[PDB]
Structure formats: structure tokens, C-alpha cells
mmCIF file of C-alpha atoms and ligand atoms in Angstrom:
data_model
loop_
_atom_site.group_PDB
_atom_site.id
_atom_site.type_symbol
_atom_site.label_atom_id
_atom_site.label_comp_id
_atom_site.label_asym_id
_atom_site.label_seq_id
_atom_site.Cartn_x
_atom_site.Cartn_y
_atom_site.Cartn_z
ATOM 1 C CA UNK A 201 118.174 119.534 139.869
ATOM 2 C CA UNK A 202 120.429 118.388 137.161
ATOM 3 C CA UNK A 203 119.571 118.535 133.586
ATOM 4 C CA UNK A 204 116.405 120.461 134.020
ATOM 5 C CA UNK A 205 115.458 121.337 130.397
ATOM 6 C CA UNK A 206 115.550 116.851 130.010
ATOM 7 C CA UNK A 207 118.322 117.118 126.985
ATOM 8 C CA UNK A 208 120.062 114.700 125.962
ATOM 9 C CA UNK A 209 123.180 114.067 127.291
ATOM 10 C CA UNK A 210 126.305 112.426 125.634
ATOM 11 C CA UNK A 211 128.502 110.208 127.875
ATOM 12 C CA UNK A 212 132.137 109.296 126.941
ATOM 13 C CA UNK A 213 133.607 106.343 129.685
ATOM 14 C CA UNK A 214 137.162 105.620 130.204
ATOM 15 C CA UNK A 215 137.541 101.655 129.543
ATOM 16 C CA UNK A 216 137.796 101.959 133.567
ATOM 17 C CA UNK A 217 134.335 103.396 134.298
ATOM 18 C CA UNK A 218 133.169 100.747 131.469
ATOM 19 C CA UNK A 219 133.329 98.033 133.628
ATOM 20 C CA UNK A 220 130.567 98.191 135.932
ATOM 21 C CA UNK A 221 127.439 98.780 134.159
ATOM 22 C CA UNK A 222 124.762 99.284 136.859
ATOM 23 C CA UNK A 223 127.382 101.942 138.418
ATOM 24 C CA UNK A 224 127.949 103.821 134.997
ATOM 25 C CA UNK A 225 124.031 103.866 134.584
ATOM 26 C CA UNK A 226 123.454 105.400 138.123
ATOM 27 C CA UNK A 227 126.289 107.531 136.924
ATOM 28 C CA UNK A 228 124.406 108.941 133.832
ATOM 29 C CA UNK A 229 121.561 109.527 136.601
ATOM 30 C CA UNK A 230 123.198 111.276 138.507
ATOM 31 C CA UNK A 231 123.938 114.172 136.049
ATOM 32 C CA UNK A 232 120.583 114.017 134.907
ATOM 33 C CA UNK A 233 120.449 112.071 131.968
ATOM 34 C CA UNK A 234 117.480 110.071 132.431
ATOM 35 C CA UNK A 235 115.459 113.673 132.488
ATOM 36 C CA UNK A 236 115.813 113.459 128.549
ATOM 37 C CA UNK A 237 114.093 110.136 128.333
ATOM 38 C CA UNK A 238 117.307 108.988 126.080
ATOM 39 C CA UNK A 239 121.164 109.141 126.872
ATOM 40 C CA UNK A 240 123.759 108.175 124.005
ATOM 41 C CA UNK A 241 127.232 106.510 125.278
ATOM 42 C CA UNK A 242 130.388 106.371 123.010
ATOM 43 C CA UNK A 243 132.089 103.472 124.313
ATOM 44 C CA UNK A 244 135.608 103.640 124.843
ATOM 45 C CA UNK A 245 138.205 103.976 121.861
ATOM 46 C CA UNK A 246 139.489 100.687 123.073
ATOM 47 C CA UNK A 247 136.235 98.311 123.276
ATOM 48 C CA UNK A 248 134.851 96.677 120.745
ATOM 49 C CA UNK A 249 131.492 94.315 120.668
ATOM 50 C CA UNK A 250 133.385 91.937 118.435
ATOM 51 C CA UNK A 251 136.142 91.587 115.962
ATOM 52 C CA UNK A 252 134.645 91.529 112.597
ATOM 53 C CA UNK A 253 131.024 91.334 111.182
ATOM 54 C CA UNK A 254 132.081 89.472 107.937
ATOM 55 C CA UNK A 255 130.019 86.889 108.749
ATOM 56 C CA UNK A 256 126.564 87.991 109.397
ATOM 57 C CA UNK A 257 124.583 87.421 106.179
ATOM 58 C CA UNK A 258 123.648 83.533 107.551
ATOM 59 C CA UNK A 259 121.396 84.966 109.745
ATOM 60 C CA UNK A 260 118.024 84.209 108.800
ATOM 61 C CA UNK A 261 115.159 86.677 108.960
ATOM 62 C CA UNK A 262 112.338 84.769 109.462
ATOM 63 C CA UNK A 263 109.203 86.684 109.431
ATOM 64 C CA UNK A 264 110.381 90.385 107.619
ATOM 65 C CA UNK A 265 107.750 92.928 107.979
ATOM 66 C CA UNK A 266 106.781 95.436 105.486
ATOM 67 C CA UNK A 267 105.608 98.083 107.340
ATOM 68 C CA UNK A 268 102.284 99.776 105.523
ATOM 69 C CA UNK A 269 101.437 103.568 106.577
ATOM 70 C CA UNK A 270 97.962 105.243 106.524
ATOM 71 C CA UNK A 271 97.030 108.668 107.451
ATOM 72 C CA UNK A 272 99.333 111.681 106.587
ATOM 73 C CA UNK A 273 102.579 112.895 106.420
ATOM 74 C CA UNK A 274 103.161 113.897 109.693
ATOM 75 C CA UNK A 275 100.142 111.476 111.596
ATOM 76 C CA UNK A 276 99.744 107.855 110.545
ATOM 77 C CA UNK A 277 99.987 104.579 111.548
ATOM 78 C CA UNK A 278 101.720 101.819 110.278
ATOM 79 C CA UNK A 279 100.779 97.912 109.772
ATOM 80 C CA UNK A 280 103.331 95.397 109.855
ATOM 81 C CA UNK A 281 102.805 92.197 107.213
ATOM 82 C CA UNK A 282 104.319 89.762 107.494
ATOM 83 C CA UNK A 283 106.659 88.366 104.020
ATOM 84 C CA UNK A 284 108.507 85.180 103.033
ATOM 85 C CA UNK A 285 111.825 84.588 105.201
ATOM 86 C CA UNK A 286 114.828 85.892 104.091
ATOM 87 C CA UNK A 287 118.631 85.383 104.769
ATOM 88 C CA UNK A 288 120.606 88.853 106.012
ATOM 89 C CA UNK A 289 123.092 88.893 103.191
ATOM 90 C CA UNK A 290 119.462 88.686 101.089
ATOM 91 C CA UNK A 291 117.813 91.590 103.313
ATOM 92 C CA UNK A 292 120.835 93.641 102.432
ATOM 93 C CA UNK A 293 120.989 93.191 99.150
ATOM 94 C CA UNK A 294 117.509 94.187 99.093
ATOM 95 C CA UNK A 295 117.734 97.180 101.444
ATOM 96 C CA UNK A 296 120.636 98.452 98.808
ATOM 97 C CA UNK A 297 118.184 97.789 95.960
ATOM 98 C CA UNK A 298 116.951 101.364 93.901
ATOM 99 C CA UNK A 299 113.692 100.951 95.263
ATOM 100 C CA UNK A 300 114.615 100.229 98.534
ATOM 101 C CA UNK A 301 118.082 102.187 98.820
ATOM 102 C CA UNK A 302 119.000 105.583 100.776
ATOM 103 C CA UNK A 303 118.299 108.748 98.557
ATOM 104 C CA UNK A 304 120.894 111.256 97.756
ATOM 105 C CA UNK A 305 120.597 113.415 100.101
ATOM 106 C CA UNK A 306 123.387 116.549 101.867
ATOM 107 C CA UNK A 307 123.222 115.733 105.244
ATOM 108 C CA UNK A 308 121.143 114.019 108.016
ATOM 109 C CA UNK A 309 118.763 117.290 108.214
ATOM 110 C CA UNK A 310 117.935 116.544 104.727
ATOM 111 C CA UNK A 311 117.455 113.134 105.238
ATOM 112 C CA UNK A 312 115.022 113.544 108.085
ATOM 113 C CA UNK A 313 113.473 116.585 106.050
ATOM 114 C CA UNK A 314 112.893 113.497 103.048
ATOM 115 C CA UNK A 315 111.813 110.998 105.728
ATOM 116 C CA UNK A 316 109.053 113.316 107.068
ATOM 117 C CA UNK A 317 107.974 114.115 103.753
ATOM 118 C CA UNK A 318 107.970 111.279 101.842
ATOM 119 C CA UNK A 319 107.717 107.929 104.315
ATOM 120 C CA UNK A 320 104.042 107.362 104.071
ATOM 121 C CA UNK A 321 104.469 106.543 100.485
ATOM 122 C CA UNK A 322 106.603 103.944 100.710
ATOM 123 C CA UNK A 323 106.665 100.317 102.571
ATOM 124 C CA UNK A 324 110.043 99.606 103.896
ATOM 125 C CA UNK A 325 111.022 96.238 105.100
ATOM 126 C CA UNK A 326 111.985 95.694 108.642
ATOM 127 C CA UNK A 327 113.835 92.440 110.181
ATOM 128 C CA UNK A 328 112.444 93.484 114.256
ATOM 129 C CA UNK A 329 112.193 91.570 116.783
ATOM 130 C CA UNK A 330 114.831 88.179 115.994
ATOM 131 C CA UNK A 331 116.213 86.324 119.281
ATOM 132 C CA UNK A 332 119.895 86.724 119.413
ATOM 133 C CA UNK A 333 123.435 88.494 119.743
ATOM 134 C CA UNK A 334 126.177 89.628 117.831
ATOM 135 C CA UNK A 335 128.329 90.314 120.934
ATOM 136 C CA UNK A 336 131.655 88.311 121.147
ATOM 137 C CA UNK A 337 131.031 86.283 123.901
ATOM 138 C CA UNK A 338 134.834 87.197 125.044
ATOM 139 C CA UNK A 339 133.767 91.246 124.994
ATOM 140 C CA UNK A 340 133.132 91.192 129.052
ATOM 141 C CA UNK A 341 132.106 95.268 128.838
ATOM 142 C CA UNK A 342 128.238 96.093 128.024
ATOM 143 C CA UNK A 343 127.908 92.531 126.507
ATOM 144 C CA UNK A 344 124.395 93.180 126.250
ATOM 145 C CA UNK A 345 124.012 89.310 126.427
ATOM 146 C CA UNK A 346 125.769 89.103 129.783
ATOM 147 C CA UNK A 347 123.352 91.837 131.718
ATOM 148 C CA UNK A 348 121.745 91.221 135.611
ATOM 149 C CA UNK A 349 118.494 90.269 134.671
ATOM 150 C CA UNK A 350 115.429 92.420 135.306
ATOM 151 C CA UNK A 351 114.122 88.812 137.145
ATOM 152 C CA UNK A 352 116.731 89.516 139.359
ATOM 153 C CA UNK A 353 116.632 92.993 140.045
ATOM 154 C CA UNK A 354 113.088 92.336 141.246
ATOM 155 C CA UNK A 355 114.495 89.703 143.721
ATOM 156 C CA UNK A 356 117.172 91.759 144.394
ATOM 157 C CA UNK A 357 114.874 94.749 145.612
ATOM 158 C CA UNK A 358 111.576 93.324 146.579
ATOM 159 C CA UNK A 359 112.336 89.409 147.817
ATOM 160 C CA UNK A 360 110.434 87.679 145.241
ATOM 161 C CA UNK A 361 111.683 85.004 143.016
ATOM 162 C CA UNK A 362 109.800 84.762 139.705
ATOM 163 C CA UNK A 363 110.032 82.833 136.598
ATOM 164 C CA UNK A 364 111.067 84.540 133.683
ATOM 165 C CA UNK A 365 114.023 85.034 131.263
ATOM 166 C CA UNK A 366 115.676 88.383 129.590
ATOM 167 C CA UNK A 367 117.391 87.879 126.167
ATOM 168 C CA UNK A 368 118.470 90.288 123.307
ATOM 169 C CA UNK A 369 116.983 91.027 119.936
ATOM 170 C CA UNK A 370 118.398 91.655 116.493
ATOM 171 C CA UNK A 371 116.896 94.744 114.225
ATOM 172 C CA UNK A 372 117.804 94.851 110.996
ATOM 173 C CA UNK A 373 116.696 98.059 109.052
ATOM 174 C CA UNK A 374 116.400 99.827 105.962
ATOM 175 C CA UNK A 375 115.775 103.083 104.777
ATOM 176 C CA UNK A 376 112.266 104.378 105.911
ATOM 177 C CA UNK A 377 112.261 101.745 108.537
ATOM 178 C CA UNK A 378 110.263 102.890 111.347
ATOM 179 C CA UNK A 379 109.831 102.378 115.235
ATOM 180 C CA UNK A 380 106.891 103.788 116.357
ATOM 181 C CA UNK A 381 106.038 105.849 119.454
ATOM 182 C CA UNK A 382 106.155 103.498 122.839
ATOM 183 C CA UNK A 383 107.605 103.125 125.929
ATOM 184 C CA UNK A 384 109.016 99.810 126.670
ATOM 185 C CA UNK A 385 107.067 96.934 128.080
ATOM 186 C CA UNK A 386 106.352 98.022 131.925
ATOM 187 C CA UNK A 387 108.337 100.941 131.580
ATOM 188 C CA UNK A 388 111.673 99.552 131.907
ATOM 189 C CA UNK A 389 114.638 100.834 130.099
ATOM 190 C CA UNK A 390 116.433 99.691 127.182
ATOM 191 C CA UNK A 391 119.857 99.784 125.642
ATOM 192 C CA UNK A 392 120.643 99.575 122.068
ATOM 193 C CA UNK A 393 123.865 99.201 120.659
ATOM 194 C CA UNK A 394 124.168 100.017 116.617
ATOM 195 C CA UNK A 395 126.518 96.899 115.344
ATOM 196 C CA UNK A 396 126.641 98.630 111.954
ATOM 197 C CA UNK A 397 125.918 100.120 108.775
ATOM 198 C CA UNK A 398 123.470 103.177 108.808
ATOM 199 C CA UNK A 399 122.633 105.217 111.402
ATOM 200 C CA UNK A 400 119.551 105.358 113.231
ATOM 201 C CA UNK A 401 117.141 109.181 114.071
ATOM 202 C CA UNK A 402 115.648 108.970 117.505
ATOM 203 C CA UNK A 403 112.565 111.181 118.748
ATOM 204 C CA UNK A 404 112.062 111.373 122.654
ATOM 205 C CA UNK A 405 109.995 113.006 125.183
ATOM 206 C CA UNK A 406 110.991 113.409 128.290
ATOM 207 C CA UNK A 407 109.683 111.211 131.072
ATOM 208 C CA UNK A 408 107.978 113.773 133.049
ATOM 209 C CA UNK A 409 105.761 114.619 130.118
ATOM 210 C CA UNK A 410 104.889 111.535 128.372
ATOM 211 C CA UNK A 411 101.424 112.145 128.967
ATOM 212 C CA UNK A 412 101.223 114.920 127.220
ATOM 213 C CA UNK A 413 102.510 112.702 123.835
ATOM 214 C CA UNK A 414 99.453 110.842 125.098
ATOM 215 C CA UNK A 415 97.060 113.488 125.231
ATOM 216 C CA UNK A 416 97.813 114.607 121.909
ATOM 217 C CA UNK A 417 97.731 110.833 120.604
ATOM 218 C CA UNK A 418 94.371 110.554 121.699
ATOM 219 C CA UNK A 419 93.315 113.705 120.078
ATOM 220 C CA UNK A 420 95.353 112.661 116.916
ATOM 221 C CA UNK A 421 94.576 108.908 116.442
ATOM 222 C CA UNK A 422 90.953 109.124 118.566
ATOM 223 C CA UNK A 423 88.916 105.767 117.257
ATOM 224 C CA UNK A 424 92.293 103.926 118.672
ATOM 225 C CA UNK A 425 91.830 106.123 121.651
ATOM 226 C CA UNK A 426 88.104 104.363 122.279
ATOM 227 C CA UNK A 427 89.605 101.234 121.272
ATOM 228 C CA UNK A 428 91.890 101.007 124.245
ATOM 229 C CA UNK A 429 93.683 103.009 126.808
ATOM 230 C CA UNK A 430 96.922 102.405 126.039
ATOM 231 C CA UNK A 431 97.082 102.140 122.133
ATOM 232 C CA UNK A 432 100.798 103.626 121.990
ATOM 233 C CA UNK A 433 101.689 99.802 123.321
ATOM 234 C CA UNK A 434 100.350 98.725 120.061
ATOM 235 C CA UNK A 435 103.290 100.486 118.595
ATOM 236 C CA UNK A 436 101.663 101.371 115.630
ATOM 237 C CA UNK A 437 101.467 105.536 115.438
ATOM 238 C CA UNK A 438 104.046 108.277 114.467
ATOM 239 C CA UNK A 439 103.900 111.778 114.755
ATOM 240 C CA UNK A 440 106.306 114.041 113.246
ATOM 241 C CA UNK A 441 108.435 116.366 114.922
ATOM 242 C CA UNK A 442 106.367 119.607 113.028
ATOM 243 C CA UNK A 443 103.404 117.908 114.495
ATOM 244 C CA UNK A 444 104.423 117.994 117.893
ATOM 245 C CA UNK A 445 106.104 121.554 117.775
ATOM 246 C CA UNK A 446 102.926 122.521 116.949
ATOM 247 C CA UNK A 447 101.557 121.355 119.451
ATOM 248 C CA UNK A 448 103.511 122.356 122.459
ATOM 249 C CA UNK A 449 105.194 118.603 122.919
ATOM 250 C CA UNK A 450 108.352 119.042 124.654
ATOM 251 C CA UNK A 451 110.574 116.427 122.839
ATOM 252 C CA UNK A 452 114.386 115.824 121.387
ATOM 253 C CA UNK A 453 116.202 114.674 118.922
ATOM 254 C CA UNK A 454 119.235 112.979 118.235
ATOM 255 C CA UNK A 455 121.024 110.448 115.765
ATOM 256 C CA UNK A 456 122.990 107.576 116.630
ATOM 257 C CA UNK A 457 125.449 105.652 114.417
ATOM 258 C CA UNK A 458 127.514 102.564 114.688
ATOM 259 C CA UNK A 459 129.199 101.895 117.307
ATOM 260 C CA UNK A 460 127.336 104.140 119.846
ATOM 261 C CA UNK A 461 124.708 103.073 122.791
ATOM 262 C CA UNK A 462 121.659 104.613 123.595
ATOM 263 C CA UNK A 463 120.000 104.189 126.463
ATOM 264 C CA UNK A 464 116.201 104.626 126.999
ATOM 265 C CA UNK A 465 114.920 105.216 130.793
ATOM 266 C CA UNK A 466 111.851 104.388 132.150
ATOM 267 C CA UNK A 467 108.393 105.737 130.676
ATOM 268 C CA UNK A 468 110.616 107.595 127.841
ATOM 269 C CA UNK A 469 108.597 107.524 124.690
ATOM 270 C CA UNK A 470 110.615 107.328 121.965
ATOM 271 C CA UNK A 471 110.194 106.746 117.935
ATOM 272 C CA UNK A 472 112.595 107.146 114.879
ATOM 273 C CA UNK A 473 113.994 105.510 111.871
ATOM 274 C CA UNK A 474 117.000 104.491 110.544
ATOM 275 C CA UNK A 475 118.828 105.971 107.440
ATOM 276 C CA UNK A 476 119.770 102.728 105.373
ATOM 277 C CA UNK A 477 120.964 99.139 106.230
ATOM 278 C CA UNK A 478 122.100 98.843 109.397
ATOM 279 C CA UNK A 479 122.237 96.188 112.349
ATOM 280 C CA UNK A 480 121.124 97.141 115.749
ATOM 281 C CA UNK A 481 120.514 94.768 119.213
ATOM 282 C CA UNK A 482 118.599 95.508 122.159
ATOM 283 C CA UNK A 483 117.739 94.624 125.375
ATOM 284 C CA UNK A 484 115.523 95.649 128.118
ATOM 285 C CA UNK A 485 116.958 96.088 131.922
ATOM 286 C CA UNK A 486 115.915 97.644 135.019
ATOM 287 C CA UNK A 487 117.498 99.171 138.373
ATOM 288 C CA UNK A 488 115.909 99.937 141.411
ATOM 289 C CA UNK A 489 114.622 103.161 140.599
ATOM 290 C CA UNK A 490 112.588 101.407 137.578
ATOM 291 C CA UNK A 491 110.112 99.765 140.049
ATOM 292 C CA UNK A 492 108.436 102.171 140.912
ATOM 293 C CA UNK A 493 107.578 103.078 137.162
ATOM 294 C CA UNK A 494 107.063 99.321 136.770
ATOM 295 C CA UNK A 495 104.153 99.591 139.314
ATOM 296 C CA UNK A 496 102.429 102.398 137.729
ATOM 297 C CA UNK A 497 103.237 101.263 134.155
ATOM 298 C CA UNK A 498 99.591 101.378 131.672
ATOM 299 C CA UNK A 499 98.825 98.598 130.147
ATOM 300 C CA UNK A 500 97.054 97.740 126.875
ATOM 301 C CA UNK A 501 94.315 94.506 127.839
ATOM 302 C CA UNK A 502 92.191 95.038 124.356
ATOM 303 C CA UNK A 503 94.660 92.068 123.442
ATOM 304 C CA UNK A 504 96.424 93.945 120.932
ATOM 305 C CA UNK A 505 99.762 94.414 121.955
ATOM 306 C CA UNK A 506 100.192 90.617 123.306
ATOM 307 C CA UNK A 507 103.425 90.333 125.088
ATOM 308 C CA UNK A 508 105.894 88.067 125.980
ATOM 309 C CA UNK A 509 106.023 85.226 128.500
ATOM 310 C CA UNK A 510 108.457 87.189 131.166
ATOM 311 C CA UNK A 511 106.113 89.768 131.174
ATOM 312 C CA UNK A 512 103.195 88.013 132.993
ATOM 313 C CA UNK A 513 105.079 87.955 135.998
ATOM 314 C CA UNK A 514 106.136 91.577 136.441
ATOM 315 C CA UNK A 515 102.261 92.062 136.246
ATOM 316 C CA UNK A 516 101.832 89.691 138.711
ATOM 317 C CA UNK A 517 103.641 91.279 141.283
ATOM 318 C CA UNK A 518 103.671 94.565 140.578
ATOM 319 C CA UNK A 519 100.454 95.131 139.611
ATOM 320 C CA UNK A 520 98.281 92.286 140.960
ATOM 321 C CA UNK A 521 95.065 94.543 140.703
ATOM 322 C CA UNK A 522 95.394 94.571 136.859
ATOM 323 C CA UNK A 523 96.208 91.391 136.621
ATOM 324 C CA UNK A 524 93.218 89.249 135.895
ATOM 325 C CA UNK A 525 92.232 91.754 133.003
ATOM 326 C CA UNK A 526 95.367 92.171 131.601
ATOM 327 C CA UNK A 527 95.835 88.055 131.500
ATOM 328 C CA UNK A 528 92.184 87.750 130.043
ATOM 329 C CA UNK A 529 93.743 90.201 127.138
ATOM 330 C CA UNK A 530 96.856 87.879 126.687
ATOM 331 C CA UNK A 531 94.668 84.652 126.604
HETATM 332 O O1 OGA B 1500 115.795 100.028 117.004
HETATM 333 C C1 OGA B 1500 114.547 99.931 116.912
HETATM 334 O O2 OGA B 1500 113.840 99.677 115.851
HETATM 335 C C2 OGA B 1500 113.642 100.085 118.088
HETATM 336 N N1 OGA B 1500 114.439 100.082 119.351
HETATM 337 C C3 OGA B 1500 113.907 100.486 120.475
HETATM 338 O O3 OGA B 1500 112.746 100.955 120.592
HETATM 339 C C4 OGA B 1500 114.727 100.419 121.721
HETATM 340 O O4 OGA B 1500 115.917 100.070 121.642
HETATM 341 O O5 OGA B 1500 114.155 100.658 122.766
HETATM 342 MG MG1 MG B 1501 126.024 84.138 109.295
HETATM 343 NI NI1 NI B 1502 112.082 101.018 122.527
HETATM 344 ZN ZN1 ZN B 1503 95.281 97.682 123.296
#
């Protein structure tokens, strides 16, 4: 078996073996990578997503969230509210602000070391979640708004022709900014490219034990536990790496900066936090080996964690048992 301690592996493509995404993805597969949960790729020295970013701060931010922790250092939950709209040339001027800016700091251990101690008392600002790219639409290599769609790897694979649509999303961080521990909506992957600026500190556990982050998330956060039972889709808790060393969580780290790709794989929980301003887009995909985790994929139907439109249909098929309750959470 390859990669059988699930760490994370580090792919460097020729500008040849960039050109066929699906094929560089089974690739990664095949040496194991999706064992981590999490695979970073260093594009090629020759690619680039597009020629300059000098003119990004037009971008509008519409709903910024400032996201509010409770609990402890190492175990709390954060609330996102919701603030006035902001431009991105505003949000960065903000993010570089002395309350809002990047520490001093030696080196990215003592930057996590200061994030683990200190985030809870602070309320970072976070620009998730905005419908777009930043890709040239002339860069024809991991254009990650040019991707197969995940509507039609399902017809691809199973027959069935659904409704549904797959676009890209803009992040744009801060220090402190947080993502908290999930997977990704029906376990699919996802692939985030860091445009620029800061980098960004991933967490990960590896596929195969993801439910022991759940077991201890229960114990840990235990009236969300009763609440529903799948609360990590609420994407509201973080646990620190101390607090899962401690408790026997097999996980790893890593940090990516601009210019890199990560890749998340099916049912890899993941959580982290980027180091200052930066710029990062994402997208969800699947292959064929995804459907199977799509099938078996939890699902939260307390109505908390209220997804998107594209969604519905993956349940539909895949899981038409849940269905009905899952739809009378969304409604
Ligand atoms: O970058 C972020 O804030 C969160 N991104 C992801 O969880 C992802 O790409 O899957
Ligand atoms: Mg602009
Ligand atoms: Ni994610
Ligand atoms: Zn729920």
C-alpha cells in the first residue's frame, strides 16, 4: 500500500503532465496521496493563473464576516456576523491595519505557536464564500473555472443526468482568519489555489480516521453533539493541534503559500488559518472513486448547515433514503 502512514505528499508536474487534470489527480492516487486527506502541487515554473493581480481591489465583498470565538484556546467555536460590504482594496487596507495586521513573529512555527495561543481573543474578518475567478480565462492548465463538472462525473459514471451547476469561490483572509473543521459538502474533494499574499496553515486527518476527529468532537463540543449528528457540517468548531495530540488524533500539518494547490480528497477533514492578507479560490470536484464516499457521506438535517442548490440532487440520487429528511432540513 502506498503512503501508509497518510502524509502528505508534495507533487511537482512538468508543464506536460499539467495538462490533463483528472489523469494528474489519479496520478497523485496512485502514490498514495489521498491517504493524507490533503496533497499540495507546485505548478510548473512555467504556468501561471494570470498575468498580474493589479487589479483586484474592485472586487466587492459583500457580506464580510467577523468571525467571534467562544470556548478556549485550544476548543471553541466560532460565529460568523455578518458586517457592512466592503471593496477588496478596502478589506486590505483593513487586514494591514495594527489591529488587524500579522504580528512580528520568527518563523511560521511561531506564528502558529501565536495563533494557537492567542486567536480566541480576537475577531478577524473573513471575505468566504464570494462567486467568482481570478483565473485568466486564456490559462487552459488547472483553470479551476474550466473543470468537468461533478454533474457530469455523476452522468459520466452512473447514467443519470441531473440539474445542477459547479462554480468557484473567492476567500479573502486576514490574519487569525479561520476555517473550521469539515469535510466538504458530500465528501467530495476540493482544490484551492492561493492567488496571493499570505500564506495559508492547514490541519488534516487522514480519511481513514475521520471518525475518530468525530468521536473526540462529540466528546469536546457535546450539547452540539445532541443537537445534531453531523455538527462538523456546521463548520463552526476548532481544535488545536495540542488538543488532538493529546488525544491520540492521527493528523498533519502543512502550510501553503502563493502560488501552490492543495488538494483535499474525499471525507478529509481539514481546518487552518491563514497568516495575513491573502487571496485564495476554490472549487469542489469529484472522480469516480468519490462516489462511493458521496453515497455514504453524513449529513447535517437540524437545518443548520443549509446548502446549496446543486447539492439537492447528489442527495437525490445518491442517497434517496435520506432524502426526505434532509430536504425537510433545507426547507
Ligand atoms: O481557504 C479556506 O478558508 C477554506 N478552504 C477549504 O476548506 C477548501 O479549499 O476546501
Ligand atoms: Mg477590481
Ligand atoms: Ni474545505
Ligand atoms: Zn446540523
Amino acid at each position: 500500500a502506498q503512503n501508509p502512514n497518510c502524509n502528505i505528499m508534495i507533487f511537482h508536474p512538468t508543464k506536460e503532465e499539467f495538462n490533463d487534470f483528472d489523469k494528474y489527480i489519479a496520478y497523485m492516487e496512485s502514490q498514495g496521496a489521498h491517504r493524507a486527506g490533503l496533497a499540495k502541487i507546485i505548478p510548473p515554473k512555467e504556468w501561471k493563473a494570470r498575468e498580474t493581480y493589479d487589479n483586484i481591489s474592485e472586487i466587492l465583498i459583500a457580506t464580510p464576516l467577523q468571525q467571534v470565538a467562544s470556548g478556549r484556546a485550544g476548543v471553541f467555536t466560532q460565529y460568523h456576523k455578518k458586517k457592512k460590504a466592503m471593496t477588496v482594496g478596502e478589506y486590505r487596507h483593513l487586514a494591514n491595519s495594527k489591529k488587524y495586521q500579522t504580528p512580528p513573529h520568527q518563523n511560521f512555527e511561531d506564528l502558529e505557536r501565536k495563533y494557537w495561543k492567542n486567536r480566541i481573543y480576537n475577531s478577524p474578518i473573513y471575505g468566504a464564500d464570494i462567486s467568482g475567478s481570478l483565473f485568466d480565462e486564456n490559462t487552459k492548465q488547472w483553470n479551476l473555472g474550466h473543470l468537468g463538472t461533478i454533474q457530469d462525473l455523476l452522468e459520466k459514471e452512473c447514467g443519470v443526468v441531473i440539474e445542477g451547476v459547479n462554480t468557484p469561490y473567492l476567500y479573502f483572509g486576514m490574519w487569525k482568519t479561520t476555517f473550521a473543521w469539515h469535510t466538504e459538502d458530500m465528501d467530495l474533494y476540493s482544490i484551492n489555489y492561493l492567488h496571493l499574499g499570505e500564506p495559508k496553515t492547514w490541519y488534516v486527518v487522514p480519511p481513514e480516521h475521520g471518525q475518530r476527529l468525530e468521536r473526540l468532537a462529540r466528546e469536546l463540543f457535546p450539547g452540539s453533539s445532541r443537537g445534531c449528528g453531523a455538527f462538523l457540517r456546521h463548520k463552526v468548531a476548532l481544535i488545536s493541534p495540542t488538543v488532538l495530540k493529546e488525544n491520540g488524533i492521527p493528523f498533519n500539518r502543512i502550510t501553503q503559500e502563493a502560488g501552490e494547490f492543495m488538494v483535499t480528497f474525499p471525507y478529509g477533514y481539514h481546518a487552518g488559518f491563514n497568516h495575513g492578507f491573502n487571496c485564495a479560490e476554490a472549487i469542489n470536484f469529484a472522480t469516480p472513486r468519490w462516489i462511493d464516499y458521496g453515497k455514504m457521506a453524513s449529513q447535517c438535517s437540524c437545518g443548520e448547515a443549509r446548502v446549496t442548490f446543486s447539492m439537492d440532487a447528489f442527495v437525490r440520487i445518491l442517497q434517496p433514503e435520506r432524502y426526505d429528511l434532509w430536504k425537510r432540513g433545507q426547507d
